[PDB]
Nucleic acid binder design. Structure first.
Lengths: 77, 44, 40
RNA sequence: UUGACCCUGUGUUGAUGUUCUAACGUUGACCCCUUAUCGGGGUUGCGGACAGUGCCUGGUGGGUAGUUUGACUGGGGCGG
RNA sequence: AUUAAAAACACAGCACUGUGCAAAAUCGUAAGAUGACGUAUACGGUGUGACGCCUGCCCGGUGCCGGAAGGUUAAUUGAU
RNA sequence: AAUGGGUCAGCGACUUAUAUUCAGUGGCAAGGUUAACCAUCUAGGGGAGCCGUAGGGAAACCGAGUCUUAACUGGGCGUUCAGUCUCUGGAUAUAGACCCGAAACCAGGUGAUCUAGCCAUGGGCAGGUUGAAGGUUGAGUAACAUCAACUGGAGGACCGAACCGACUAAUGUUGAAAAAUUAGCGGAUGACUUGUGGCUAGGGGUGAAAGGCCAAUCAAACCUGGAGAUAGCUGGUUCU
RNA sequence: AUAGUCCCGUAGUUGACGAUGUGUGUUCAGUGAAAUCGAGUAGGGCGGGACACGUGAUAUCCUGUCUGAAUAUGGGGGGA
RNA sequence: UUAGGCAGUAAAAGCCACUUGAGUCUGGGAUUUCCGAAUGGGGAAACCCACUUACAUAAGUAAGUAUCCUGUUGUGAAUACAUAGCAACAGGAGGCGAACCGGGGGAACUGAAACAUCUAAGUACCCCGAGGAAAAGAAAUCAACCGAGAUUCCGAAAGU
C-alpha cells in the first residue's frame, strides 16, 4: 500500500473545496519514493518505500536506528 | 418458445453452490445471513 | 546537511573540515563512499 | 557564460549551457534464489538528476456529476 | 426477443487523422492487462460507403496544428 | 351519464415523547417548586436550578425610574394589578406527527441457466445445379500473348429439405400459446448454424447501432437497506 | 363448575461426595516496559479536517506537503 | 432420587424393575461417521485421490502430513564472509455470534417550501480490531489575581 515504512504516513482523506465551497472528497497521498539505503552493519543496500519526510528522519537518526524501529513494528526489512 | 430457465446442474453448482458461496467474502455473507435467518437450504 | 570530511575534496574542503553540503551529495556520494560523515 | 547582491577582483545566491555519476529509470543482457517470460537479489550496458511520482498551483475540461431554466395568461406556447 | 426488416446498420473500397513501440488508445487508484508475442504495407479513432465520372469556392467563426516577439497571468517570493 | 363501493364479517386513520403557550382545577402564596441523586424507595432527604418579586437602555450602567438630547415645554417604555408547582384540556414546536400512495435518489449485495458480444472445445448442413482459376492436348507466337477441345471444381454462387429465420394474410386476442397456429415467405458452405463450458455486471456490460439486450422487466436490472424519502396533490377519516 | 385445608406447590426448615465460581491472603512465573523524562518534536508556510465555531478579527487541536526551535537562564496555554 | 421404566407421534411387541445397579436427575468421564474455519491435496459442501511412517501380505490397517505470524535450530545461493532462500521444531492465529465499544472509509433521499454553501450526517452502509465491557484518564487542564485539581456518567447553567 501507499504507506511509508519509516513514518507510517498513509493516504489520508480530505475535501477539495471550490470557490463556491463545494466539498468533494479527495485523498492526500504521502510523497512516497523508493530509495536504496546502504546499511554498513549488514553490508548491504536496503530498498525502502518511504516518504521524503522518512528520508529526513533517516538523515537525523541514521539508517541503523530506523531499521531497528521498523523491524520492531514488524516491517520486513 | 425457449424460456429463461435452461437448467444444468453444473452451472447451478458453480454459480450458486456452497463452495462457490464460500469462496468469496460476500458469498460467505450470504451463507451466514441465510444461516441466521434459519434457512434450511443455504445453497443451490 | 553539515558533514565532516574524512578526506580532501576538490572544492568542499580538507580532511576534518566541517562544511554544509546538499543532502543529496552527502546521502548519495560523500557518506556512502566514506569521503565524509554526518556532522552530528 | 551570465544576473543580482556582497564587500575588496571577491565571495553569496539565481538562472542558462555543457560535461559527469552517485540518487532514480530500464517493459536490454547475464548470474542466483529456481524445475519460474512473476518477483527479488547480484553483475553489466543504456539512460540520468531528466523522467516519474507526492504536495501546491494556473489552464483545459458535458468525459462525468449535481442542479437551475419565473409568474400572469379568456388552455398553454409566442407576443406583451 | 413481443406492432417498424427498411431507404436504417454492416460491408469491400476510399480519405483524414493519431500512433516510433514502455506506441497511441482502452480497462484499472495501482499492479497489471488488451493493443501484440504485432511494429507504420502495423495498430487506433473519425467520416464516406462496390464500381464509373468526379468531388468546385470560402481559413472570417469554432476546432486542430504551428509560431513565438510582446501584453496579460497562479503558486511562490516577500521590496516598501 | 362525475368519483368510490358486488355483499357480509373482521381489521383499518389526529398518536406518543419532549418543550413553549393559553385555559380549567387543586395546593401553597410574595413566594412557588425542587432536578439528578440518596433513600429503611409513591415517604423523607436533596436548593443545584427555574419562575415570580422592576424597569429602562445597543451597552456600560442607572433604577421607580430610565432612554433620548447640549437640554427638553418634551417624547418613548415603565412605575401603581399574584404568582408558582401539580393535574386535565386547547393550540404550537421537534420528531413519520392523521392514515394510505409515487415517479425517483443513495449504499451494499445478487444475476450473462434468457439475451448481447467474445473465448475454448465438439457437432450439423437431403438432393440437385452452375462451371472460376488452374491443367492437358491440339493449334498459334521470335518468345509471348492468343484460340479450341478436354479436364478441373471456385463461390459471403444457383434451386431446394433438415436447420436457422420471420416478409404477407387469416385465425387467435377471458388464446391451445404472457407472441402461437395455418397457408404462403427468406437464408440454407457461411459475416452460417448448433451443443457444452468459460468471460464481461448496472452509469456498468454487451450492441453489423434498434436506446436494442443484460432471466416474460431496461433513457440506467434485480434484491435488501437508508426508508415511514418527499408528496403545497388525490383518496379516506369510524358514537350521540 | 369457582379449593387456605384433594393434589403439586408456597412460607419456613434443611441438603453437595464430587465438580465449579468468588474473595482473601501466601507463593511462583510473567506482563506492565516505552527504559532512563521525551526533536524531525513544538512552532511555521501551503492544502485540508476537528473543535458548538461554515475562515471569519479566529485562538486551540490533528496533519498530506514543505520546513523547523528553545531546551527551566527554557518552554506551553490563558479565543486575533 | 425412588416405583415404575424401555423418547414422541403411537399404538402394539419383546422386555426390565419394584427399596435399590429398574429407571430418573445433576456433574464428570468414554464414544463421537461425514461435511463445515475445515487444515494432507483436490472438490459440484456432506465426495474423490494421496504421501510418509509403522505395521501387516497381499493390493490392507493405523497414525501423521494446511497456511501464515513469532521464536528457535539447523542447513544454505548469486561473490569471500554473509544474507536471501530452504528445512525442522515450538508457540500463536484463522471461523461463528443480537447488541454494546474503538478505529478505517462514508452516501443520498430529505430540509432549506427551487438550489449549489449549509442540512440530512459523520447518520445509513462497507471494512478492520477488540473486550466483558470498550474508550478515556492523572493537567504543557481550567480559572482569574481568588482558586480548582485525572477520566467517565447523570442534573442544571441553557436553547444561554
Amino acid at each position: 500500500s501507499r504507506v511509508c515504512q519509516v513514518t507510517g504516513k498513509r493516504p489520508v482523506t480530505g475535501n477539495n473545496r471550490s470557490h463556491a465551497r463545494n466539498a468533494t472528497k479527495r485523498r492526500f497521498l504521502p510523497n512516497l519514493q523508493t530509495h536504496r539505503f546502504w546499511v554498513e552493519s549488514e553490508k548491504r543496500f536496503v530498498k525502502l518505500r518511504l516518504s521524503a519526510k522518512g528520508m529526513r528522519i533517516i538523515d537525523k537518526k541514521g539508517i541503523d536506528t530506523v531499521l531497528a524501529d521498523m523491524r520492531a513494528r514488524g516491517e520486513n526489512v | 418458445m425457449k424460456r429463461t430457465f435452461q437448467p444444468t446442474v453444473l452451472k447451478r453448482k458453480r454459480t450458486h453452490g456452497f463452495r462457490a458461496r464460500m469462496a468469496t467474502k460476500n458469498g460467505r455473507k450470504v451463507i451466514n445471513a441465510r444461516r441466521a435467518k434459519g434457512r434450511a437450504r443455504l445453497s443451490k | 546537511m553539515q558533514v565532516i570530511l574524512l578526506d580532501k575534496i576538490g572544492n568542499l574542503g580538507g580532511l576534518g573540515d566541517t562544511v554544509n553540503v546538499k543532502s543529496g551529495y552527502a546521502r548519495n556520494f560523500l557518506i556512502p563512499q566514506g569521503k565524509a560523515v554526518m556532522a552530528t
